[PDB]
Write a protein that binds this DNA or RNA. Structure first.
Ligand SMILES: Nc1ncnc2c1ncn2[C@H]1C[C@H](O)[C@@H](COP(=O)(O)OP(=O)(O)OP(=O)(O)O)O1
Ligand SMILES: Nc1ncnc2c1ncn2[C@H]1C[C@H](O)[C@@H](COP(=O)(O)OP(=O)(O)OP(=O)(O)O)O1
Ligand SMILES: [Ca+2]
Ligand SMILES: [Ca+2]
Ligand SMILES: [Ca+2]
Ligand SMILES: [Ca+2]
Ligand SMILES: [Ca+2]
Length: 341
DNA sequence: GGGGGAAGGATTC
DNA sequence: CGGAATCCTTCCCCC
């Protein structure tokens, strides 16, 4: 089996450049402003010029202006990045049939019935890696290996504007030389946990006992790391369909007043329904982020689809159920819809 | 014991 | 310090 992985480079910031070439060369920073005050939000993306000075996704806009006060701060425009993304996907879908769109900027192509030999694949990369830019002017990275995971790991290493292959021999070298923190699916919390057990390489997962491991990262996660280490990881490429659509907003003031919240919650719902498009959800969750950034949320599932009217109706019950089962003040409130018909 | 889910909390990105 | 979506873990009804 041969998996080819494409990943659009510094995507949001890269699109704002295609749309405004002048920016190419200068530090660009796409961010999300909440509203509580001027320049209050987080950074979503930054091109490499901005990154090499310490600006990366996740940090406070304030903390970034204090580093590159003279950088171009642009507001995020997801609807645009989504359309540009959709065109390229369709552009990718002309190489394989077996295709898995992971996110707005990633995709896995099972280029197996279209190719052989790694060399034959690599070439296919430089190809894809070139039609995209010809037609859309976007630069991407390609990674290719035996399974989904190593193909990604490859692309991570080989970025930016790269292409790279990890044959079966190189995989073996990695299963024992690569930091676990760098395995897809593993994050800060689970990462800073495997240490507490004495694991830093995929290979370690074989030493530790299954029950010990199973109890810090989880049974699913555990089985996942073991499989990669035994080199038994092999998941078919496929589809993936949004199983949930929702929206959350930050209120100008943290509050516990049902009347104050209601308007923000209703804005979330109306926005949510628009995105639902022609999909009927049978479940709904009200979601709230406390001021210490916790997330609490109550939902209800229905034996049939939900109408905006029922949605407006039920959400208020859920918003209360919450306000009761807890004590903290609310900062952000929103809704999520799932179990589509 | 465990299927089959709904409901609640935690993570990754 | 923002926001979207998924991912895991527990509780329940019952054969
Ligand atoms: N806290 C966050 N809030 C909003 N969006 C975020 C946040 N953290 C990360 N992201 C988004 C922005 C990007 O779409 C994406 C980052 O993807 P990434 O695949 O790691 O590639 P890269 O190193 O080439 O640059 P880029 O990340 O921007 O695409 O996730
Ligand atoms: N909750 C989740 N747990 C694990 N993987 C997820 C989750 N949600 C989404 N993904 C997957 C599918 C996404 O397309 C993919 C990655 O999104 P993304 O912004 O690219 O990069 P990344 O997670 O790959 O880390 P990096 O910052 O190095 O690029 O992760
Ligand atoms: Ca990317
Ligand atoms: Ca990506
Ligand atoms: Ca990254
Ligand atoms: Ca990592
Ligand atoms: Ca990232």
């Amino acid at each position: 089996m041969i998996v080819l992985f494409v990943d659009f480079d510094y995507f949001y910031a890269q699109v704002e450049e295609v749309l405004n070439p002048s920016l190419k060369g200068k530090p660009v920073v796409v961010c999300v402003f909440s509203g509580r005050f001027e320049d209050s939000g987080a950074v979503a993306t930054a091109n490499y010029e901005a990154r090499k000075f310490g600006v990366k996704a996740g940090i406070p806009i304030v903390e970034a202006k204090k580093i590159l006060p003279n950088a171009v701060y642009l507001p995020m425009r997801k609807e645009v990045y989504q359309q540009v993304s959709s065109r390229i996907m369709n552009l990718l879908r002309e190489y394989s049939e077996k295709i898995e769109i992971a996110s707005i900027d990633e995709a896995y192509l099972d280029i197996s019935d279209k190719v052989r030999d790694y060399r034959e694949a690599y070439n296919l990369g430089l190809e894809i890696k070139n039609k995209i830019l010809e037609k859309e002017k976007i630069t991407v990275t390609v990674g290719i290996s035996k399974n989904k995971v190593f193909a990604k790991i490859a692309a991570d290493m080989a970025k930016p504007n790269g292409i790279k292959v990890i044959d079966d021999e190189e995989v073996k070298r990695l299963i024992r030389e690569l930091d676990i923190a760098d395995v897809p699916g593993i994050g800060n919390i689970t990462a800073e946990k495997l240490k507490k057990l004495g694991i830093n390489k995929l290979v370690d997962t074989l030493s530790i006992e299954f029950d010990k491991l199973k109890g810090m990262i989880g049974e699913a996660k555990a089985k996942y790391l073991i499989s990669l280490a035994r080199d038994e990881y092999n998941e078919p490429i496929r589809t993936r369909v949004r199983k949930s659509i929702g929206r959350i907003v930050t209120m100008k003031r943290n509050s516990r007043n049902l009347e104050e919240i209601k308007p923000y919650l209703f804005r979330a719902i109306e926005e949510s329904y628009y995105k639902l498009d022609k999909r009927i959800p049978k479940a709904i969750h009200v979601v709230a982020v406390t001021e210490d950034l916790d997330i609490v949320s109550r939902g209800r599932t229905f034996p049939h689809g939900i109408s905006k009217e029922t949605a407006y109706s039920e959400s208020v019950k859920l918003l209360q159920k919450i306000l009761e089962e807890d004590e903290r003040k609310i900062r952000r409130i929103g809704v999520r819809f799932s179990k589509f018909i």
